[PDB]
Amino acid sequence: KQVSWKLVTEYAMETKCDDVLLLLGMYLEFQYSFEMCLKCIKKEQPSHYKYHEKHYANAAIFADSKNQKTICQQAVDTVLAKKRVDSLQLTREQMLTNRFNDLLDRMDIMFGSTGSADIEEWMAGVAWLHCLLPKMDSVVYDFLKCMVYNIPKKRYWLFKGPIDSGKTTLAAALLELCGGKALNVNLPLDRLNFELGVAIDQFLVVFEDVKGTGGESRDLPSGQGINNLDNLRDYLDGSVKVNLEKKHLNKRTQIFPPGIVTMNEYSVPKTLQARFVKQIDFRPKDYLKHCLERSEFLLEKRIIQSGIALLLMLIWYRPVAEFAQSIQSRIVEWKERLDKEFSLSVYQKMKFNVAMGIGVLD
Amino acid sequence: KQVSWKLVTEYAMETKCDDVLLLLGMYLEFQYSFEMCLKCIKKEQPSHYKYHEKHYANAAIFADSKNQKTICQQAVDTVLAKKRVDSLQLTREQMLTNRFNDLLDRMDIMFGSTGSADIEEWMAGVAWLHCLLPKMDSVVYDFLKCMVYNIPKKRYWLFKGPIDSGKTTLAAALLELCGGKALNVNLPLDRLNFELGVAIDQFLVVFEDVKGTGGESRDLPSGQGINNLDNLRDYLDGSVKVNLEKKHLNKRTQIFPPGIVTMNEYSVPKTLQARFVKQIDFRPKDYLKHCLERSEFLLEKRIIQSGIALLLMLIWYRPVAEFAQSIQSRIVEWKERLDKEFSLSVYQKMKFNVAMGIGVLD
Amino acid sequence: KQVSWKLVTEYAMETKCDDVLLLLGMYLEFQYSFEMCLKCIKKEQPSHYKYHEKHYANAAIFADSKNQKTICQQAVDTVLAKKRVDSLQLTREQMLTNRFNDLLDRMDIMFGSTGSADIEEWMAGVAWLHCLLPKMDSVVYDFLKCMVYNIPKKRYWLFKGPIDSGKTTLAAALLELCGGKALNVNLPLDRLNFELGVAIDQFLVVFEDVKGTGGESRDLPSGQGINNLDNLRDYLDGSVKVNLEKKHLNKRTQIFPPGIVTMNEYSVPKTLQARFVKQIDFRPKDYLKHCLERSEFLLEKRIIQSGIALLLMLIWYRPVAEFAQSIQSRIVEWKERLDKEFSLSVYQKMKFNVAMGIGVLD
Amino acid sequence: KQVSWKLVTEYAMETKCDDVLLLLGMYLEFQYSFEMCLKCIKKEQPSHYKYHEKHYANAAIFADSKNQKTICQQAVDTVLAKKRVDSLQLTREQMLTNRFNDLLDRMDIMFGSTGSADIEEWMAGVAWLHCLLPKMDSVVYDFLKCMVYNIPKKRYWLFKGPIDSGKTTLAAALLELCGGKALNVNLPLDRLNFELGVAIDQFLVVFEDVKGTGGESRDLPSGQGINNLDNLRDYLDGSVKVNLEKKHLNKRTQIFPPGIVTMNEYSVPKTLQARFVKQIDFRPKDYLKHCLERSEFLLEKRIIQSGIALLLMLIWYRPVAEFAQSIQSRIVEWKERLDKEFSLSVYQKMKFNVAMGIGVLD
Amino acid sequence: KQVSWKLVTEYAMETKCDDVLLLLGMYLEFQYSFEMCLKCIKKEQPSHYKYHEKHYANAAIFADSKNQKTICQQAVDTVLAKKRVDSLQLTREQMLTNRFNDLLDRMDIMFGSTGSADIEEWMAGVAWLHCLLPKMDSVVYDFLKCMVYNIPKKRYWLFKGPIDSGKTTLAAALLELCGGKALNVNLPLDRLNFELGVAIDQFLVVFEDVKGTGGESRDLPSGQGINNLDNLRDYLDGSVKVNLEKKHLNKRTQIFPPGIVTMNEYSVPKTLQARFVKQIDFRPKDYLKHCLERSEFLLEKRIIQSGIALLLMLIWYRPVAEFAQSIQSRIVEWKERLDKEFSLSVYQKMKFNVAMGIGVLD
DNA sequence: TTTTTTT
Numbered sequence A, B, C, D, E: 001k002q003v004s005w006k007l008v009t010e011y012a013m014e015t016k017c018d019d020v021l022l023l024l025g026m027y028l029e030f031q032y033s034f035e036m037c038l039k040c041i042k043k044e045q046p047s048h049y050k051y052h053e054k055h056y057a058n059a060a061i062f063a064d065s066k067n068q069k070t071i072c073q074q075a076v077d078t079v080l081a082k083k084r085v086d087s088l089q090l091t092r093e094q095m096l097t098n099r100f101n102d103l104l105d106r107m108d109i110m111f112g113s114t115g116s117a118d119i120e121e122w123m124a125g126v127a128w129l130h131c132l133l134p135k136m137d138s139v140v141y142d143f144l145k146c147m148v149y150n151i152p153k154k155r156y157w158l159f160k161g162p163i164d165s166g167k168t169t170l171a172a173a174l175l176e177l178c179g180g181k182a183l184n185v186n187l188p189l190d191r192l193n194f195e196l197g198v199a200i201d202q203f204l205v206v207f208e209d210v211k212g213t214g215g216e217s218r219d220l221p222s223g224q225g226i227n228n229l230d231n232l233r234d235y236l237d238g239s240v241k242v243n244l245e246k247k248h249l250n251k252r253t254q255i256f257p258p259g260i261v262t263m264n265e266y267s268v269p270k271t272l273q274a275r276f277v278k279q280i281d282f283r284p285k286d287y288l289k290h291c292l293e294r295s296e297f298l299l300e301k302r303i304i305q306s307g308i309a310l311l312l313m314l315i316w317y318r319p320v321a322e323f324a325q326s327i328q329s330r331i332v333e334w335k336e337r338l339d340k341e342f343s344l345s346v347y348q349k350m351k352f353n354v355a356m357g358i359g360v361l362d
Numbered sequence F: 001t002t003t004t005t006t007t
């Protein structure tokens, strides 16, 4: 009998696998007998136990084959081909809707019967995130719409505040909610060349902790990031296509993606201040610090950094009609799921605990 | 049965794909039944629904095949071969006539029944651009004439002026009309060679926002760009061929393209001013600035940066005889469309609105 | 029924193609029917209409083939193989005699019944070049002997003088007459390897617009050229075989070509001054500018740079006996055309016009 | 009806080709019929008229074949394989004996009645060059003896002296008398990897114009060469096998060959100074230059640089027993044949003409 | 029939052949008949006449084969693979056994029937070193066993003395008895990290001429070398694995090799003094200089500075039963050779005349 | 792999 190359390519497509060694290893685990597989019976990894039943007959023949890495390469090139087709043909609203579909799939497993996580612990995360800024759910929705519409010169937001105020916490959650990357522009103009190359085909970027110079009475390290941003003005404005470089690969011409700049209270040049739409001032708050000392599980599970928490915030607060037409069905299912388990009185009691600096789940 | 490699090569020539991954992704999705195909029913992308019914039989057999990327690589070689043949054998008037034909195909789709845009928005763009410089249609035409003749020494145009003065708006629109690339020569010398390699076979080059030295006299940043340009003087003149390189590929010998330099008001060494045949001064105009803020659809849809707008300007103002004899019959059809859907009073009112800082549609 | 690889090899040999993409593109055009081809009926490019009828049957079999680039790579290597054989086996007099035959073939097509060139406009170029230096045909003939005899350490010529004085003009014309490559040595030492590799198997090199270190008090830019070139002294002499390099290919060992160095009034080290035979000083001549300004057809058609203009000068002034024995019989045919289509007096009027700063033709 | 790969390998062994494009070009010329072959009738090159009649039948079938470059690779590999066998298994005296046999075969054909050269002008070469130094012919013998012994850590020679002093013409003459390759180590140390790779299985290495640090006040610019050699100490000592590299081929483990360094008057670090066995320093002379001005055939025909001129000198001054025993019978034929024409009285007269600066002839 | 690839691999294994083109070249020699072979009758090399009778049948088929280099590549990979199995097991004793095997075989040649120098020069040098330092025949055997055991903290020996005392000249011979490299730790601390990386995967390290501070009190130059070395605590002691990096490579983790420090007479901080297991003081002796001056061939043949002189000393004095139980048989022959080629009394005569300051062969 | 990256 012969290997079906078509069944391998299907598995790669449905697993969304970019990687020749990961695919090869995953697929070789299907050769052992289905009826007695310990990895199925512990139900431990979803990308195994959902597929082993189908692929056993092909995996047995594949284990005898001589072509193995050649079969996996064609499968991986098919998955890479779809990504490139999508990048050039989807509108930004569809890219975001696909990303929410990926997140909702992970939530269904994570809060399912074999799930590890309590939904009570993640709703405590929504209560703590809501106290970080005024009107958080509007701020998150304004951010999403701004990244979708991508209007020239209305592309970037500035996060400003003392050390330990929440800047990296909120930024990391937005990066997970709509996939993106972090950049470090504090380097010399020499090395920036490959640093800016991380943004190739990304939806969103964050410039993390850019350092100015001067203001030394404030007790701040000096660096050159603000000078660099002032020379990188064209990338922030975004009217024109710029050349971007990865190590060993040819230059690509792109409209550089929108993003977030985080900084301490360094002085902005009047030039740079004008490229931003909004600045959000973060300030330290004593009640939130006392709360985290008495609700450690938020930090230790990394709940407050995670985009699943921001999505649960959006699901609770925003009306169904703001979401795109195809995802609305999953959302009304998830709303009814949540309203059945959290009474509004319990959620207001969670928020009242956070405002008092007491532990959330008393 | 066996795959027809000839039909794949035919598809690549009709859609003009250079990317092997993009061609592979496109061709695979034809494998599903044409009678049901959702993107054909939705009329989503012209690169798909115009072809699916023809290629369906071959795409099913291609999905079974074991040398898919060898098939796609040969098809991409075939499209590259036509580009190099056309580059050595066509006169620059024919190269430009072919670029106008591509744009007019986009305009037929874009302003047809399937398309999203409409003419009164984009024609207000042509009214806005005409207020930027005196006699804009003569300046655009005289530029096109210069680039087609490509006379040595008498070859490059210099745009200078304060920030927010429309240099990059015009330069990006001229770039989109002719086709070409933007280069950032502000770099260190040891990596300029790969930057200049982006010019290979292009029709235009635009050297964007080159920094000088001595800017503190004006409160301007400092950078090497103007000194690098003084070392590249051989590339600007175009008297003799230069050697250009892409990463991992052997050097190619050709005459460097003509084009545009944009800069802030640095002092220019007189040996470089001797090499620029025309200098166009841009200055702040407050009425243009007020008009954009009240007419922001001009930015949100990128109407003012786009070469389709400049071609509509040429169609409105130029007499039919100045286009090459091949494309004239297609242009009189467009003059008829525009003179049907508009009147002089409508366009005279749009320019009247701009000149008073009123909204262009008021 | 199978492709004959020998027919493609003949076509490549008769056409002299060095790159695989160009050979592939040319040959794929032959698959369409000979009885209707528009490119044959217009007689537009001579590489097509002379060969299509012979190759058509094979081209349709080539278009079905699974192996196309492999076929073309063998054919291109066969053309490169002949050029390597001749570079070891021929004397330099025969190399130049062959290059003159190639030029005289182009002159038959340019000035034939089926081409655009006007012999009066090209003989107007001879008048302008004959004014640039005194005794111009003596200079051209002494240059040619220097390149043919290739006497060690007496091989290079130096051109000095202001910007806009005819030095790059005459260098480009000599470079087309002999054939060769133009090289840039103003970049730093560490990437010169692949630049000097452009000189492999060539007859001439021209080092364009070399920059010195000093002279800044004259308002002349500083750079690395003369420092680099003083390290390269071993390449200039041609007493010893050097090692030359291209990407992915092994070291070639050969004597480096003779050539021309061009520069703008920098001072030169005594070690470099010892390795040039003759220095030519160019000083601006006002009447040549006012002539050229009224004679813009010279620049558009590039006549004053073209090697054909110096070959026409040699046919006008030199005796017949001092061309090689096989090419004399074609030169005497060209002597007769020029004495039929011009008198002396029409040529003497043109040369008087150039002295007067009037347009060359009147 | 198959191509004989055996016959191609025999042609490469008899011609001793070591480049694939050259062998391909040479073998393809044999496909045309033997009878009418214009090159065989004129007898232009021995590598053609010796072999065509034998190889014709195989070359016609080679011209139909489609593996052509793989056939030539296996033939060139066979020739490179034999040189490595010789390089290990021959006695080092016999390698020099073999190289003289190659020269003595080549010297006989060029002084044949069919040859272009003549005895008196090449003996003027012997006269001029023996005048260049004190006791020249015994200095050449001392060099040959030193290289033949190759006593570890007692190999290399220095030369030192200024421009136009004579060092490089002597080094070039020795290089052709032996087998050898010139190297340029003035480039930065990390690039030298493939430069040193040329010495693989060579007899002599010569380092030409190696530059020190400082001394620039004499108009002798600096470079990395001497610091490189002090790093490359392990290769001069060569008491152990070094590892030498070339592109896409398995690397060679070998002792680096004996050789010569030529320099201008730089300082030498004591660590490097200790490696060189002998230091034959140079001084300029004036009547020799007066003679060359009047005797231009010497440089035109490259008489003074060639190893044939030193071999004519060693034939002149050396006793016949000092050579190897196989060539002893050839050397008496050249001793006699040379004396039979060129008597000592006329030799002394023209040697006086050099000494007096007259110009050598009569 | 077909080629046996295993017969080729047997020849490569038994010849211990490391290199593809060398294997190809030697195996092709077996094409011709065994009975007639001229090399077999002369017996010039063992690698031919031992095998030709056996391998002739295969070599007749190998000559017709169309993929000869692939056969040889597999054979060489088989010999190279066996060296990496042996790397698994090498105890540091067995490293020194085979390091000696490589050096005796070069002694067998150089002093042999086909030799190049006579032991009467070498033995007077061995007698000279046997009076440079007290009891030195015991020192070298003790030194080597410290290196073989590589006991932590017991690793390093300090050679101290004023200039011209014998330090560098003995360090050369010990480094050539072992294998290793020298390091120059006088560099500023920034550059030391790359210098130390040269020790990657080696048996021995030698540190040369560490500059102190305060040595100007005796006109000694001063520098950081001692202060750098005092800070390399973990590299000297050898209890823990340390990181090493070459330029352009990733960091390697290993125990740092043992070694020798040679020092120009400065003071040593008592921290650094605790790192060295034994200190050797070298002192000027004028009778050693008079001896050298009256025996200058000792230096000019470089008798003193070789691992050959130290191995020859280990042969003379030490007993046989302490050499490894395999290699000890090869010292039987060099003992009996020396005991008969040289006189037990003549040694004492030349040590006497050395100590007398008389010429060592007088 | 070589080149590019690294230095």
Ligand SMILES: Nc1ncnc2c1ncn2[C@@H]1O[C@H](COP(=O)(O)OP(=O)(O)O)[C@@H](O)[C@H]1O
Binding pocket: A132, A162, A163, A164, A165, A166, A167, A168, A169, A170, A283, A284, A285, A286, A288, A289, A292, A299
């Ligand atoms: N608004 C706040 N008030 C008090 N503590 C905070 C606040 N936001 C965050 N923290 C504390 O600071 C830690 C780090 O927050 P992060 O956002 O990573 O720092 P930064 O604001 O400097 O980027 C959190 O884990 C939490 O313990």
Ligand SMILES: Nc1ncnc2c1ncn2[C@@H]1O[C@H](COP(=O)(O)OP(=O)(O)O)[C@@H](O)[C@H]1O
Binding pocket: B132, B162, B163, B164, B165, B166, B167, B168, B169, B170, B209, B262, B283, B284, B285, B286, B288, B289, B292
């Ligand atoms: N005459 C003008 N006066 C003031 N602003 C202008 C004028 N023309 C264009 N603009 C502004 O130019 C902006 C485009 O950027 P641009 O000025 O071209 O950048 P740069 O000057 O760096 O090339 C537009 O967003 C618009 O607001």
Ligand SMILES: Nc1ncnc2c1ncn2[C@@H]1O[C@H](COP(=O)(O)OP(=O)(O)O)[C@@H](O)[C@H]1O
Binding pocket: B152, B153, B239, C162, C163, C164, C165, C166, C167, C168, C169, C170, C209, C283, C284, C285, C286, C288, C289, C292
């Ligand atoms: N006699 C002259 N006076 C002024 N300009 C001249 C003269 N001769 C040639 N030129 C100019 O030389 C230009 C070409 O450059 P050229 O002077 O040959 O080299 P470079 O600019 O490097 O010195 C032509 O476009 C032409 O305008």
Ligand SMILES: Nc1ncnc2c1ncn2[C@@H]1O[C@H](COP(=O)(O)OP(=O)(O)O)[C@@H](O)[C@H]1O
Binding pocket: C152, C153, C239, D162, D163, D164, D165, D166, D167, D168, D169, D285, D288, D289, D292
């Ligand atoms: N005595 C001499 N007479 C004439 N020319 C000489 C003499 N010595 C050297 N040369 C010139 O220098 C070249 C090589 O000698 P060398 O002293 O090495 O010069 P360079 O230092 O320029 O290489 C010769 O080929 C020749 O052109």
Ligand SMILES: Nc1ncnc2c1ncn2[C@@H]1O[C@H](COP(=O)(O)OP(=O)(O)O)[C@@H](O)[C@H]1O
Binding pocket: E161, E162, E163, E164, E165, E166, E167, E168, E169, E170, E282, E283, E284, E285, E286, E288, E289, E292
């Ligand atoms: N103990 C000694 N007494 C006198 N001269 C010596 C002594 N040791 C070496 N020499 C001489 O000193 C020269 C330099 O030796 P070297 O090892 O460079 O000195 P150092 O001990 O400073 O390293 C030797 O070549 C030798 O001629």
